[PDB]
């Protein structure tokens, strides 16, 4: 009975591959071979945020493009005022091993999580005036890797137990559970309309999930190694995915296949974070080779290089309104580029 | 320069936060962080329980704080986690050392421990941190050797001919076969260790049991040695 199931599975896979080939009438490179190529963009570190003790593992931008949240491996969640280089809050963490952090769109709450398998939500602005532990979520059987707020009451989290979850802050239970990945869900990215979200795991595949219905809409398999960087395109009809094989891929939800590939002979190290600009023209990827790169999402050639960041770069992020880009590495430094 | 009242308040709050961060920096840099790793039969839980003399169902990680000679050490045991370790192991890049506990008594599984130790030793993000080996359950290994089965030769052909090294210091009243087997296991680990450690990290070996109370002192001595070697390397003296 298992043999016929395997035969039907491989037949369906072949049918999907044939459909993708049929829908692949032309490549993205050929269409964009006539557009004006982007020039050489040079970034300068306009601001430094030296205040951490251990490696910075993740960071997130606020909706005001002024306040950002940074998570350090020593057990600190620091709110940085980007303009004035001022520290707004410094939240100690019960578990020093933190791998992700999120900033709520309203700016009232902040998310944290890591090897403790518990997502901690802290209220930034209370009546007392101190940032306390508002809520703790303990349902995952694996280490948390990426969390993103949807509103003040719901949050989507991913853990290493091949499971994504949707949590209601007040109740503290899992509203929806997504179990389609094979191993070590690494990153997630919410769509602009918040209806769906994309997720990348270590099984060299990406999956699109619906927040409300709760099932995998589409699955994309185009990488060769572990996926550790994913981000949603501003248009909402595409996204980018970065792997340890020194390669980024551009996937589209309407084509169900990779649009283009960003790679080079010189680069052989992995990619930890990926982000888009306001227009989506520039794709920023943090390679773990003491540097960062900026490509263009239309012809796949080098456009800019960011340097001066000691140790592997861990977190990358452009402001929601496109002001600047913040990069955090394992050297306990945050650098702002404009 | 001219600043607003709100800007002055923000600067004062930032100064207070910086003062708190400076206060916490001394605490952070005065504590040594260790990563405890081992198999299910390695007996690391017994080691933690013995060394504790100094939550939820999915806690994900357990921390134990022990103080030796007024020096604090935070050892982190990994639990309620999947068998995949290629990703979260990168989190322990700045730890003082990795305490790898291997049960040498039980055979037909020492190859798995050797492979795991080799993967840890050759890890790109673990090429600087040192490894402290705990050959746990030595009494069980001695009893198994004295049982007469002599199954060590079957699993490892290299044990067919192996002379005890001259640097060996067997305990009094110990069978030479037990010493030979124990040092053969130690040399099997050391052969893997001495292949990519170009003066960066070492493989301090220790023969341990589930009842030994000197494990904390051994860990403290190994950490002191690691710190001294790092300081000497910073001065180009070694």
């Amino acid at each position: 009975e298992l043999d016929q199931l395997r035969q039907e599975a491989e037949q369906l896979k072949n049918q999907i591959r044939d459909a993708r080939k049929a829908c692949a009438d032309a490549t993205l490179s050929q269409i964009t071979n006539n557009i004006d190529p982007v020039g050489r963009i040079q970034m300068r570190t306009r601001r430094t945020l030296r205040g951490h003790l251990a490696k910075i593992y993740a960071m997130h931008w606020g909706t005001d493009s002024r306040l950002l949240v940074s998570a350090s491996q020593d057990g600190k969640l620091i709110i940085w005022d980007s303009y004035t280089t001022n520290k707004v809050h410094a939240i100690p963490l019960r578990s020093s091993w933190v791998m992700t952090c999120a900033y709520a769109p309203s700016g009232n709450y902040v998310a944290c999580g890591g090897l403790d398998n518990i997502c901690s939500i802290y209220n930034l602005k209370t009546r007392e005036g101190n940032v306390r532990v508002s809520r703790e979520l303990a349902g995952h059987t694996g280490y948390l890797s990426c969390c993103r707020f949807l509103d003040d009451n719901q949050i989507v989290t991913s853990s290493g137990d091949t499971t994504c979850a949707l949590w209601d802050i007040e109740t503290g239970q899992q509203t929806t559970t997504f179990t389609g990945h094979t191993g070590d869900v690494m990153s997630l990215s919410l769509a602009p309309d918040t209806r769906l979200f994309v997720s990348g795991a270590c099984d060299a595949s990406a999956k699109l999930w619906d927040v409300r219905e709760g099932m995998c809409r589409q699955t994309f398999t185009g990488h060769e190694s572990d996926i550790n960087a994913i981000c949603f395109f501003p248009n909402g009809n595409a996204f980018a995915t970065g792997s340890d094989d020194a390669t980024c891929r551009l996937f589209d939800l309407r084509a169900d296949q990779e649009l283009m590939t960003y790679s080079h002979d010189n680069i052989i190290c992995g990619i930890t974070s990926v982000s888009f600009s306001k227009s989506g023209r520039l794709l920023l990827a943090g390679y773990d080779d003491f540097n960062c790169n900026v490509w263009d999402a239309l012809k796949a050639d080098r456009a800019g290089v960011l340097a001066g960041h000691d140790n592997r770069v861990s977190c990358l992020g452009v402001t929601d309104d496109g002001m600047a880009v913040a990069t955090g590495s394992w050297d306990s430094f945050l650098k702002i580029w404009n | 320069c001219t600043l607003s009242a709100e800007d002055k308040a923000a600067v004062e709050r930032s100064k207070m936060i910086e003062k708190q961060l400076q206060k916490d920096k001394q605490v952070y840099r005065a504590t040594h962080r260790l990563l405890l790793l081992g198999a299910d039969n390695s007996g690391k839980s017994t080691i933690v329980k013995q060394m504790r003399i100094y939550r939820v169902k999915t806690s994900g990680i357990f921390e134990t704080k022990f103080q030796v000679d007024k020096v604090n050490f935070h050892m982190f045991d990994v639990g309620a986690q999947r068998d995949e370790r290629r990703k979260w192991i990168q989190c322990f890049n700045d730890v003082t050392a990795i305490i790898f506990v291997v049960d040498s008594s039980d055979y037909n599984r020492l190859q798995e421990a050797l492979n795991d130790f080799k993967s840890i030793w050759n890890n790109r993000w673990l090429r600087t941190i040192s490894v402290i080996l705990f050959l746990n359950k030595q009494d069980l290994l001695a009893e198994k050797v004295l049982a007469g089965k002599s199954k060590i030769e079957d699993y490892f052909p290299e044990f067919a001919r192996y002379t005890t090294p001259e640097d060996a210091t067997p305990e009094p009243g110990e069978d030479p076969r037990v010493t030979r087997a124990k040092y053969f296991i130690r040399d099997e680990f050391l052969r893997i260790s001495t292949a990519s450690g170009d003066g960066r990290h070492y493989c301090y070996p220790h023969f341990t049991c589930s009842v030994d109370t000197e494990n904390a002192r051994r860990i403290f001595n190994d950490c002191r040695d690691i710190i001294q070697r790092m300081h000497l390397r910073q001065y180009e003296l070694l």
């Epitope: 190694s225 572990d226 340890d244 094989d245 | 995949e84 993967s119 030793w121």
Partner: nanobody
Framework: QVQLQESGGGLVQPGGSLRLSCAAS????????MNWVRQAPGKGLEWVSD????????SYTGSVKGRFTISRDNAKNTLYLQMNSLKPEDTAVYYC?????????????????????RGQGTQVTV
């Protein structure tokens, strides 16, 4: 997509010889270190042998050292395992596992229960 297909199983009398071939598709074969995993009935995954990207560094477990040989064909993207003088204790399922990351000597999770970059395996009975 990662494809790893094994071929060469079947019943063999004790002391026989076998040729196990692993075909890899979906990635650059030369950039990844390869190794074999063994799963005996009523037992867990066991590592047998490993070979690096170029084949210069090769190693085997003690139980099979001197009896099994491994080789690579980067031109055809194939991994070959020659078994000589088989034993009744070798009746098991053999899998070809690929290192998660390229241009790296070490690689974890080779013998994982649910490892992704591992083939379906072939049954060898002695």
């Amino acid at each position: 997509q990662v494809q790893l297909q094994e071929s060469g199983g079947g019943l063999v009398q004790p002391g026989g010889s076998l040729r196990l071939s692993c075909a890899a598709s979906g990635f650059t074969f030369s950039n990844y270190k390869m190794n074999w995993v063994r799963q005996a009935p009523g037992k867990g995954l066991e590592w047998v042998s490993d070979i690096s990207q170029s084949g210069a560094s090769i190693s085997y477990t003690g139980s099979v050292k001197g009896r099994f040989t491994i080789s690579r064909d980067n031109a055809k993207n194939t991994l070959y395992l020659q078994m000589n003088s088989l034993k009744p204790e070798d009746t098991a399922v053999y899998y070809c596992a690929r290192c998660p990351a390229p241009f790296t000597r070490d690689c974890f999770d080779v013998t994982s229960t649910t490892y992704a970059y591992r083939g379906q395996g072939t049954q060898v009975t002695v």
